């Protein structure tokens, strides 16, 4: 009594959606994405110290960081079409690897695996178009 | 264009006894070098494909930039964010794709 403290960490897979945003394709065509992620804590004590007081949200904004990131970088290599037709999910799943593993049992600093958090999937909820050329289409 | 960075603090003393107000120093100096870096390449390739050289050159300008500082601050990842054209060229991006719509 007095002396500890206890704090509580769910270890349940949270999951963390983004809002509509726009993304510039090969061909300069703008897309409205939205996209969601699942997340689950690795090593809880790692977790803890690199947010500060373990807090979701903290946690939730590196990862939009990162996930912003890689995301464009990916779109930007790709069609349209391409993003449309693909049905594997080829560039989320490559996307996931990023985020889990980074560029430099070494661990990269910049990978999420630095962080307490392991990301799980990763998937595209919907795919707009601006309103101008939804109308032209 | 926007531009996110994360970093940590190693050796306090450095931090503490270096420069005044360490953050701020390193805001200023991640602000210079994503100028510098945008300033060499054209617009099509930062919008499109230089994306991942852009972050590359950024985080290596930043980490030299900060060098003669000696600040306690050690480098996480430099991660692009956006880099949309102004509004005002926005709406002829647009007219330019449904100009394509048009034409078929």
Same mark, same amino acid.
């Given at each position: 009594?007095?002396?500890?403290?206890?704090?509580?960490? &769910?270890?349940?897979?949270?999951?963390? &959606? %983004?809002?509509?945003?726009?993304?510039?394709?090969?061909?300069?065509?703008?897309?409205?994405? &939205?996209?969601?992620?699942?997340?689950?804590?690795?090593?809880?004590?790692?977790?803890?110290?690199?947010?500060?007081?373990?807090?979701?949200?903290?946690?939730?904004?590196?990862?939009?960081?990162?996930?912003?990131?890689?995301?464009?970088? $990916?779109?930007?290599?790709? &069609?349209?079409?391409?993003?449309?037709?693909?049905?594997?999910?080829?560039?989320?799943?490559?996307?996931?690897?990023?985020?889990?593993?980074?560029?430099?049992?070494?661990?990269?600093? %910049?990978?999420?695996?630095?962080?307490?958090?392991?990301?799980?999937?990763?998937?595209?909820?919907?795919? %707009?178009?601006?309103?101008?050329?939804?109308?032209?289409? | 264009?926007?531009?996110?960075?994360?970093?940590?603090?190693?050796?306090?003393?450095?931090?503490?006894?270096?420069?005044?107000?360490?953050?701020?120093?390193?805001?200023?100096?991640?602000?210079?070098?994503?100028?510098?870096?945008?300033?060499?390449?054209?617009?099509?390739?930062?919008?499109?494909?230089?994306?991942?050289?852009?972050?590359?050159?950024?985080?290596?300008?930043? $980490?030299?930039?900060?060098?003669?500082?000696?600040?306690?601050?050690?480098?996480?990842?430099?991660?692009?964010?956006?880099?949309?054209?102004? $509004?005002?060229?926005?709406?002829?991006?647009?007219?330019?794709?449904?100009?394509?719509?048009?034409?078929?």
């Amino acid at each position: 009594p007095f002396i500890e403290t206890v704090k509580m960490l &769910d270890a349940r897979i949270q999951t963390m &959606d %983004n809002q509509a945003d726009r993304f510039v394709t090969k061909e300069k065509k703008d897309l409205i994405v &939205d996209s969601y992620i699942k997340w689950r804590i690795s090593d809880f004590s790692r977790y803890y110290l690199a947010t500060g007081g373990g807090d979701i949200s903290q946690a939730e904004v590196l990862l939009k960081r990162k996930f912003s990131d890689r995301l464009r970088s $990916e779109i930007g290599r790709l &069609d349209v079409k391409d993003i449309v037709t693909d049905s594997r999910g080829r560039l989320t799943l490559e996307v996931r690897d990023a985020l889990n593993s980074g560029s430099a049992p070494v661990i990269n600093p %910049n990978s999420m695996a630095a962080l307490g958090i392991e990301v799980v999937d990763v998937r595209i909820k919907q795919i %707009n178009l601006p309103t101008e050329v939804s109308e032209a289409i | 264009v926007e531009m996110n960075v994360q970093y940590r603090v190693t050796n306090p003393e450095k931090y503490l006894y270096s420069v005044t107000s360490p953050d701020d120093s390193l805001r200023q100096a991640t602000d210079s070098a994503l100028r510098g870096v945008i300033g060499k390449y054209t617009m099509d390739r930062i919008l499109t494909e230089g994306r991942t050289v852009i972050r590359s050159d950024t985080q290596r300008e930043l $980490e030299e930039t900060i060098r003669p500082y000696d600040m306690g601050i050690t480098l996480l990842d430099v991660n692009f964010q956006a880099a949309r054209p102004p $509004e005002e060229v926005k709406a002829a991006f647009d007219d330019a794709i449904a100009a394509r719509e048009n034409e078929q």
